[PDB]
From a paper:
[name] catalyzes reversible transfer of a γ-phosphate from ATP to acetate in the presence of a divalent metal ion. In the present study, we report the biochemical characterization and structures of S. typhimurium [name] (StAckA, NCBI accession: NP_461279.1, residues: 400, molecular mass: 43.3 kDa) in two crystal forms at 2.70 Å (apo, Form-I) and 1.90 Å (citrate-bound, Form-II) resolutions. StAckA protomer consists of two domains with characteristic βββαβαβα topology of ASKHA superfamily of proteins. A cleft between the two domains forms the active site pocket of StAckA.
Another crystal form of StAckA (Form-II) was obtained in the presence of citrate. The structure of this form was determined at 1.90 Å resolution using a polyalanine model of the Form-I StAckA monomer. Although the overall polypeptide fold in these two forms is similar, residues 230–300 (variable segment) were in significantly different conformations in the two subunits of Form-II dimer and these conformations in turn were different from that observed for this segment in Form-I. Residues 277–287 of B-subunit are close to the active site cleft present between the domains and occupy the space where ligands are expected to bind. B-subunit of Form-II represents the most closed state while A-subunit represents a conformation between those of Form-I and B-subunit of Form-II (data not shown). As the residues of the variable segment are also involved in the formation of active site pocket, Form-II structure is not suitable for binding nucleotides and therefore may represent an inhibited state of the enzyme. Examination of the difference electron density map of Form-II StAckA showed significant uninterpreted density located at the dimeric interface that was distinct from that of the polypeptide chain. Citrate, a component of the crystallization condition, was found to best fit the density and could be refined with reasonable B-factors (33.9 Å2) and occupancy (0.75). Interestingly, only one citrate binds at the dimeric interface resulting in an asymmetric dimer. It interacts with atoms (distance cutoff: ≤5.0 Å) of residues Arg178, Asp227, Thr228, Ser229, Met230, Asp257, Thr258, Leu259, Gly260, Arg309, Lys312 and Tyr313 of the A-subunit and Arg309, Lys312 and Tyr313 of the B-subunit.
Numbering used by the authors:
A (entry chain B): 2 to 264, 277 to 400
B (entry chain A): 3 to 237, 245 to 270, 277 to 400
Amino acid sequence: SSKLVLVLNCGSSSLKFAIIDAVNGDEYLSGLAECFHLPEARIKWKMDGSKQEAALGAGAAHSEALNFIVNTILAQKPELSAQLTAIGHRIVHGGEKYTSSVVIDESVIQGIKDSASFAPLHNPAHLIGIAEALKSFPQLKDKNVAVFDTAFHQTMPEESYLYALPYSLYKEHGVRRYGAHGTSHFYVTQEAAKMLNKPVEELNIITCHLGNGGSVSAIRNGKCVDTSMGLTPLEGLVMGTRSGDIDPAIIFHLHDTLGMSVDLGLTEVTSDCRYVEDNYATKEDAKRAMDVYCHRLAKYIGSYTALMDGRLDAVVFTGGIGENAAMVRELSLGKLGVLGFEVDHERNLAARFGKSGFINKEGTRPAVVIPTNEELVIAQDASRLTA
Amino acid sequence: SKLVLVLNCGSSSLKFAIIDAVNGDEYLSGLAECFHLPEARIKWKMDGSKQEAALGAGAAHSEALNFIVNTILAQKPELSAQLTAIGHRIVHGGEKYTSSVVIDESVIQGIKDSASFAPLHNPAHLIGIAEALKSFPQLKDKNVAVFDTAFHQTMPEESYLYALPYSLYKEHGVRRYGAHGTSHFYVTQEAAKMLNKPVEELNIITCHLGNGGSVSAIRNGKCVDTSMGLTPLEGGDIDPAIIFHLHDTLGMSVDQINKMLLGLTEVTSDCRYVEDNYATKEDAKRAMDVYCHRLAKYIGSYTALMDGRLDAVVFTGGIGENAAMVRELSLGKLGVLGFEVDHERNLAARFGKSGFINKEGTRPAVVIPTNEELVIAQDASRLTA
């Protein structure tokens, strides 16, 4: 009746996980293990309607987190464990070789190893996740599935994916642009079509995934035709600064100027284990970074009018920041008055903390907040490919 | 009538003109090139026929200037006598030089100290100054520097900062400085005239295309953002994929990325060959499509600087002034913005002719031939009066 999938998303400092029924999206477990390789290493999870938290021990990382999942969390619930039909892994880079999700075998693992040069920070983490998954769940060893953040973007034509350099760069070396957060962009695209009550294959939108890293895509007739992760150029390359190492007063200021003050994606985004792009010395330094970010965000959105062929249906906001940071949406859209955008303050405040909705003034260009669910898409793909 | 010798000295070439600063009249123009090579040569136009001569094997800046003085002007002592000033194109003036300046010892040092930002240009400019001081000793106190970066110094920090730790700016001055600012300046002044409105109220996006162009956002007559140098249509170690990624996402040249992280550079250049480098129709089309796609994206990106109002897009430069299909193909992508090109107007506005190329009733798009040499003559005359 149900097809439960264990979903693993390993990064350089954390591991986000869930158990999800791929048939209807029911969540049986979700959580976040974070502050890896530090004294503060910890794990937060939600199960049977209740939130829980434990220390993983000083210096713990992925192996330890998975151990705690199997021997503490799932040890209480062997019945849950028994239901698992597959494991889905979120993988940053699949290049041109893997343009859709795929069952993991030794050559897929080799493909991931060979892609170390793309988001290198998270590369070891993905592999450790696969290695530990195979060990901890020997019964599912032929039913691990890789789901690639580049895959959705494989529809980009060459005018979009080529660098502004000699064609030989691509012809001889295969150097090329690829795209980030593809599973999220994919998810919000399918959802936008429902919210706008139209066929996905007629959908022209611009999608802004603002989370761990920030990317913007141009969707024409339901397919990605251009994308950039230039909002956070160093994401996946450079550690950045742990939020908890910054003066708490600076961080409170950042969170409040973002528009995240009340009046899973959210737990991650406000975490003192989240890494940020600069070691802000002052409140002013933090605000500057935010203003630069909103300026660049507005430019990306404007730039993708060049992909819309005369029709733009909506701009979509998603991810830890996009779903919750009302001021990022206000300030970025507020720079695009010439395109007929106008943010409705009350609508914008309401579309936070997991609530979806339109944030435009009715009668002006649609702007929409759609909480992403990368874990569900990974579950659906993992279940579909192992059935 | 106030004649100025205008020089733009590069590592392997020297562009020159004599311009009446009062009315824009041109008395001489030319280009010396293939320096440090067997084929070093000079082409010029005067009275008003086109000529060319070899400068001699290995010749460079000193020979080029010697030729101007002793061959081109030897027959025109009255032209030589009417020279009132010399204006020099300087690629990088950093944050210090926000307008044109009479060259003295401190300006020389300014140019030197900031060579790191433009290591292949600023040094050649200095040779040009040194050689001009020799070749035109009567004008020794009347040399003026005009900076390609000056017009761009009105950019606020939200535009000029890269998406990098703030220490890179604070400690090392890593920042957008802009390119072709003398051209963006010029077409901004002219656009206000074509649109019949004050320059202080002008919101436009200016596209200097040609010679590694750039696109700027002008709000209330001032530059508020500008692009990196575009690639012209001829287009133990960190993985190169990361370098290109950083280049593309930051908007920083491959060289400035590596940096922040006897011309060999011209030994196989075009001016060396009689025949041409082959380019297939398919490869030419691909290059065109990539260029026009990226150009349209820049234009759309700068709607985010316009604060609700975009008066016009402006095209200029050797490509922008002349390439009808670049304008049609790039604007063709921006229907959302209300752009639509009229083919016949588009074809009319070429080869030195200005005009509107938009369809009547659509967002204005204008071709304005740039005149950087006039701006340089104007500044040089004004500042030395």
